[PDB]
Amino acid sequence: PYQWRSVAIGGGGFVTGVLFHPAERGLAYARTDVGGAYRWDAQAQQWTALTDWLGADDWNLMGIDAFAVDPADADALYLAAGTYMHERAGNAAVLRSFNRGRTFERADLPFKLGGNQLGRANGERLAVDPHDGRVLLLGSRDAGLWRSDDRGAHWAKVASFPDAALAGATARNHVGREQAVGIAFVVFDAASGNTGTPTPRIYVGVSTEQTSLYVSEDAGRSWAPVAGQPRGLRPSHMAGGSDGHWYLSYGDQPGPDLMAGGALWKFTPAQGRWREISPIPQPASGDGFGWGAVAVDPQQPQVLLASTFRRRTPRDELYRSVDGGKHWAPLLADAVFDHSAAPWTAHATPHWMGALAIDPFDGNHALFVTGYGIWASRNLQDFAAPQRPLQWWFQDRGLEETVPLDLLSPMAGAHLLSALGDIDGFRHDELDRAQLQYAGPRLTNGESIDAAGQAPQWVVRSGTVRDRRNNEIRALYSRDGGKQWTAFASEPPAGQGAGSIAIGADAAQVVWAPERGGNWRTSDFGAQWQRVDGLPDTAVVMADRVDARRWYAVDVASGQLYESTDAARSFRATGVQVGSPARDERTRPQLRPDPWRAGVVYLASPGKGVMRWQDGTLQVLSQPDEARSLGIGKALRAGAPPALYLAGRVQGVDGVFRSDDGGVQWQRINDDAHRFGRPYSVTGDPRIAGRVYFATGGRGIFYGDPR
Ligand SMILES: OC[C@H]1O[C@@H](O)[C@H](O)[C@@H](O)[C@@H]1O[C@@H]1O[C@H](CO[C@H]2OC[C@@H](O)[C@H](O)[C@H]2O)[C@@H](O)[C@H](O)[C@H]1O
Ligand code: NA
């Protein structure tokens, strides 16, 4: 019923795997940690998202922990889907397609996977037997090795593979939490097999400092450690093999967090020989770096690519060898990058290169992943610097992977301003063209953003600064609609940045609630702060859009509604229960004052449905099964109530909805193919009737219009 379009950013997240199909030129796939999988469509020159049909119940399948194609069947595609292994996350599943991801069938697995956990960029854990495509293997993170003999429709544990093989296959992430990393890859040795019969020789890499490489000679019936293997580091990839030489990348951690050592090994099983072939050595002192990935040219078995990982001396490098590891050349330092597709990438640095792949039909064409998208070479074989430099382009059309944290559609200015994880955000001058990030000071996360209802040129945002060590001020304000920004003169005396921020209708007052700090009021952008009187620290404050004297608050811990009529100096408890907010990416109360009427507020919560607060009264407008995220925009007809938009569950069905009768009746405006999991930050456009924006937890921002 609506047409949904991506807000153009360009990648923006960590692509954890890339894969060419050797049976068809121009066919490739990508997997991501938070945002599903993609098929490169040579005819449209774009990546096509393959898992937007995931509904709200299946948000955890957006993390793609592994993927595989059948070398003998260009139509087959297999995804190992599962994002977290913690208690609130469901079991994993193999999604199988026999039309390149157009449709999927689902095999539920009895264990969980780690699509957005440590080791997510190790691969590939899922593999198809290259001589009998009926057979697949899947390495789990904490449940051993699993096998299918019916093209992934049913799975059973490989009883002969010991669970103890995964001993020590855990690690701490950046915030201290232990995670099950388990198996890093499963590799068939195709040279060992013949068409029609299961491949006899199979390698299994385990992300552990103990024995990390296992091999079977009898199609998985028995298992042994590979003789002579190095120990103490964790393998992440195993490539090559067709000429009898295998290439394995190692780090001192599973990745992507915290790598500070590693190695690159060449393994020649016929000679029982192991040779360290790392392009550059580890530092004698100070932090080292890992080898994030290795790949072999499908047409040229002695041609290798290998990436450093978390090299900060000075930055990461990608190396090429054409003689099996004997000599290497650096690639990126002398290369040219085209940022015209995503201008903001000119200020990014290639990093987190945990996956590489070379086009099996054109050795000139190689992909490497970063923590912000894919780069693609044009002339990897043919370049000669400086007159003919290696050329990289941002092959990311159709691929959108940001996790927005807040969205703003102001009464004037750009139609959308975003607050995004990792890359701060944008003033979206054009929704269909990628932009530069906000001018002025640079935040890590953009967490909260707001604009004055009656003076929309005044914008404020807050967020994080990763590895903050120089007292960076984490709230910023603009007076020209987000074109230029200035930091607040100080932070309030309590809290740790981020949180939620709001600005009154005439731009004279800002209320900022830093993380764990409670609410603080300023009338001079942080020159001075006062604690807001009469609110618990867990309250979130929103401004009226019309009357600068009016503000509102919902205590997230209790669901109680508070009200201010003194420009947010103080708040009274209204006596009214509006419900606690749905847990989302950022648990935030859904309180939306009427852009056109002072003192009219629309609210939503899972517990109470959709409500209107006006004239000291709460009216329940409707009671959907779960009202999660509420937005307000221009009425479709003049004189009619403002349009309301809802992401949630109505009559057992999840989706995104619009009400035209003031929130009493809802109509579904997306369809099952465009559910994107659990959309949030539903945001109307006060200037465009029918327009709605919403965030997704790894597929970026979308906007829709009727028809
Ligand atoms: O700015 C890019 C890169 O800089 C490194 O110095 C930093 O350590 C790294 O986090 C950054 O890479 C991004 O990391 C985030 C996830 O960040 C979180 O997990 C890893 C920790 O190292 C971080 O401290 C923590 O904030 C990814 O979402 C991005 O895709 C990736 O670019
Ligand atoms: Na906001």
Which residue minimizes the CA distance to atom 22 of ligand 1?
Answer: 257
CA-CA distance, 342 to 223, in Å (whole number)?
A: 47
Same domain, 241 and 295: yes
Tokens 């139609």 correspond to 415
| CA 585 to ligand 2 center in whole angstroms | 14
Report residues whose beta carbon is within 6 angstroms of any ligand 1 atom.
Answer: 13-14, 174, 257, 351-352, 371-372, 422, 466
Tokens 């004279």 correspond to 508
| CA neighbor of 631 nearest in space, from 593, 671, 598, 576 | 593
Domain finish residue from 401, 426, 458: 401
Q: Count other C-beta atoms under 10 Å from residue 386's C-beta.
A: 8
| CA 503 to ligand 2 center in whole angstroms | 9
CA-CA distance, 694 to 506, in Å (whole number)?
A: 26
Give the nearest ligand 1 atom to 466 CA. Answer: 26
CA distances from 616 to 352, 465, 511, 531, 575 (A): 54, 40, 23, 25, 10
Domain finish residue from 352, 379, 401: 401
Pairing of strands 366-370, 356-358: antiparallel
Which residue minimizes the CA distance to atom 12 of ligand 1?
Answer: 371
Range of the domain at 542: 1-11+402-707
CA distances from 441 to 65, 347, 476 (A): 35, 13, 8
Give the nearest ligand 1 atom to 258 CA. Answer: 22
Resolution as reported, in Å: 2.0
Q: Which residues contact 321 (CB under 8 A, 6 or more apart)?
A: 277, 279, 302, 303, 304, 306, 327, 328, 329
Do 140 and 122 form a contact (C-beta atoms < 8 A)? no
Give the nearest ligand 1 atom to 403 CA. Answer: 28
CA-CA distance, 181 to 177, in Å (whole number)?
A: 12
Q: Count other C-beta atoms under 10 Å from residue 330's C-beta.
A: 14
| CA neighbor of 248 nearest in space, from 229, 227, 228, 225 | 229
Which residue minimizes the CA distance to atom 6 of ligand 1?
Answer: 310
Do 63 and 120 form a contact (C-beta atoms < 8 A)? yes
Same domain, 476 and 371: no
Helices (H) and strands (E) in the chain, counts: 0, 58
Same domain, 414 and 322: no
Do 462 and 499 form a contact (C-beta atoms < 8 A)? yes
Same domain, 6 and 50: no
| CA neighbor of 104 nearest in space, from 47, 155, 148, 61 | 61
Do 213 and 226 form a contact (C-beta atoms < 8 A)? yes
Same domain, 228 and 215: yes
What was the structure determination method?
X-ray
- β-bridge mates for residue 655, sequence order: 648
Give, for ligand 1, the residue of 257, 374, 466 to mutate: max count of ligand atoms closer than 8 Å to Cβ.
466
Residue count (the chain) = 707
- Does residue 422 have an active-site annotation? yes
Same domain, 632 and 548: yes
Same domain, 159 and 149: yes
| CA neighbor of 214 nearest in space, from 302, 139, 155, 270 | 139
Amino acid at site 109: L
Same domain, 461 and 343: no
- Does residue 33 have an active-site annotation? yes
| CA 542 to ligand 2 center in whole angstroms | 8
In 153-299, the DSSP E strands lie at 156-157, 170-172, 178-180, 183-188, 202-206, 213-216, 224-225, 234-240, 246-251, 262-268, 273-276, 290-297
Same domain, 191 and 209: yes
Radius of gyration over every alpha carbon of the chain, rounded to an integer in angstroms: 27
| CA 504 to ligand 2 center in whole angstroms | 12
Overall domain count for the chain? 2
For CA atoms 575, 577, 583, 584, the dihedral sign is negative
Ligand nearest to the CA of 255: 1
| CA 449 to ligand 2 center in whole angstroms | 4
Cα 704–chain centre separation:
21
Q: In what order do the strands lie in the sheet with 73-81?
A: 64-70, 73-81, 93-97, 105-108
Do 683 and 704 form a contact (C-beta atoms < 8 A)? no
Residue 143 token pair: 């449940």
Same domain, 501 and 646: yes
Same domain, 545 and 640: yes
Tell me the three state secondary structure of residue 429. Answer: coil
CA-CA distance, 471 to 444, in Å (whole number)?
A: 14
Give the nearest ligand 1 atom to 370 CA. Answer: 32
Domain finish residue from 379, 401, 423: 401
Ligand nearest to the CA of 349: 1
Q: CA angle at residue 165 from 163 to 169, to 5 degrees?
A: 100
Q: At 344, give phi and psi (nearest 5°).
A: -65, -20
Q: DSSP for 368-397?
A: EEETTEEEEES-TTT-BTTTB--EEE---T
Note every long-range contact of 672-675, with CB atoms under 8 Å and residues 24 or more positions apart, other chains counting.
Answer: 672/53, 672/55, 673/52, 673/53, 674/4, 674/52, 674/53, 675/52, 675/53, 675/54, 675/55, 675/56
CA-CA distance, 198 to 180, in Å (whole number)?
A: 30
Which residue minimizes the CA distance to atom 30 of ligand 1?
Answer: 371
Do 88 and 6 form a contact (C-beta atoms < 8 A)? no
Give the nearest ligand 1 atom to 174 CA. Answer: 21
Q: Which residues contact 58 (CB under 8 A, 6 or more apart)?
A: 90, 677
Half-sphere exposure of 130 (CA within 13 A, CB side): 17
Catalytic residue among 422, 450, 594, 685: 422
Pairing of strands 145-148, 156-157: antiparallel
| CA 481 to ligand 2 center in whole angstroms | 14
Same domain, 326 and 414: no
Residue 546 token pair: 């019309």
